Amino acid sequence: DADKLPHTKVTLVAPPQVHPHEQATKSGPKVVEFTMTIEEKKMVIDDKGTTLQAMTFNGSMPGPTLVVHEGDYVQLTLVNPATNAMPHNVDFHGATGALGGAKLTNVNPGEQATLRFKADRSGTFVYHCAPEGMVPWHVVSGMSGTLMVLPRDGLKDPQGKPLHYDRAYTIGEFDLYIPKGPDGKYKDYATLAESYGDTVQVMRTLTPSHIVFNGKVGALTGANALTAKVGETVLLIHSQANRDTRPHLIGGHGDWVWETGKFANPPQRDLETWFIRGGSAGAALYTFKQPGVYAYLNHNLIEAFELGAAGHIKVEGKWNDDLMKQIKAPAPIPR
Template sequence: MKNFRLGILATSMSLLWAGGAMAATPVDQLERIQPKLLPPPFVMEHDQVAKGEPKVVEFTLTIEEKKVVIDEDNDTTLQAMTFNGTLPGPTMVVHEGDYVELTLINPTESVLEHNIDFHAATGALGGASLTTIQPGEEVVLRFKADRPGTFIYHCAPEGMVPWHVVSGMSGTIMVLPRDGLKDGQGNPLTYDKVYTIGEMDLYIPTDEDGEYKDYDTLMESYGDTLEVMRTLLPSHIVFNGKVGALSGDGALKANVGDNVLFIHSSANRDTRPHLIGGHGDYVWETGKFNNAPEVDLETWFIRGGSAGAALYKFKQPGVYAYVNHNLIEAFEKGASGHVVVEGDWDDDLMKQVSAPGPIKSK
């Protein structure tokens, strides 16, 4: 009878393990890691398939309130609020079942309270109510990454959420499935490079002559900025915090044959990413990896307050434009960038059959 009961217990335990109902190790005994966060468009080093048990992944974000130049050609500035000094904040990567343990620091030189709302988290306003800190304070928040996908995080202080978000305080966290990305048939998908693109709508006040105003302090800019925000008409719509951030020396790089994953976030407004000359081989428009990706898209839709992901294998060299395909927003407001691809040209995919010349009379 004793052996029979032990057998029943073992079978029950196996079923619990198989169903994921029981953690293998208590959270306070899990391995802890401290990966290095990178400034966008770059993404921290990570495994595409999880190794071993879930981990506690420790991150630190330091709030920085500072003036930034958002358009060098016109010397246009923004009194910004940032995570780790960048617009957007750095992209974090964990695996489903991992625990995110964030230390949020609000330095003494700040003038405002701040917090963080993780769209990937469950409970307490995404952590916002548990992370509100004044200048000179820090706080530690832990949450379980219990669903895979790409998710926004942003600052969300009571009564001031829009101002903090459109002043730069947003970023992305990617929660990968433990066994990696899959296509619609369950086949593995991998990437050679990954870039993060944070699309941001900015609201810079102008003076009576129509020139963009420059402010000495964050609080000095508040009233005028609020007026512009309430028009719902952004002065700039940019990738990664400034006009031209992803062109010239900042252009994204790839080689022919590379599978590149583009993580695109927009904390406030809807957008329509498009890769001119390429496609979305596999696209998770809503960013949620439990859903099968759409395939072969020309343009995809990212809802305001979300992040999506698109995977594309480059087949031709050249300069590709990556744009918001509201082309007015791309070419007039700044929502565009470039991907520079090296490699050999394939005439079978595209070829100029004859060079431009005079019209031949018939």
């Protein structure tokens, strides 16, 4: 039992990376220790300077991804610094009991707490803040991320054959509800508490003002695009703690996808577009076969291109004419 098991300490990393870890392991169960510190801050979320009175685990939207193996215990120290204004907690969907841990992690500014639970189920699971009476506001303002519980012998296909990834990326998709004033301009609030009432009103319309990957329009574009090479297998972890989304890799596929995010279930293959239910994290593997700049996006194209739910993946390597060839380039229609 957990008091007799070896402990290990994991250092988290900022999205869209994921901290180093093993897939299949010869290691036995451990109590894996993590720490997160809550940061409330105002963030610029689009290219015209709109701000969000935001709330984060570890300073980022999403929070960092935590990786353990089935049968490990997650032991998180949750810190709420006195520089914050609101109480916070955490609800791990991967956990069993006490509202996912929320009941045992209620921290006011200047407080901290330590929760342990058993990661007895494999998969990608959302975690998110959930203070009594303020749940949706904390979630939509940025307080969510992914716990990935890998099977002890790695991922498996529907026939039980081994699957793997060579790199992993974590994408959180955030439906935002930014209020507007009488002039039709987005409101800028001096404090987090001042944004509340107006935000609730926008939330109740069910219409996001912005839907962003990793905290801002274009977060995963340009110098910040995801990268890969031909022949590399990428795992794309996609979390949406509040609202449905439908990920698609343009010019690629989901080779093996667990859209409900639970690795004891067989994956589906060859997907064009998959579905992440609001309140869950899903996972797709894809092995790149062509070089070039791919778009990874929500395939409600309005939500992607107008509202912000789209990123890029820049892939190195040799073009393959067997998979795709320009036979005749654009030219005048023969008369």
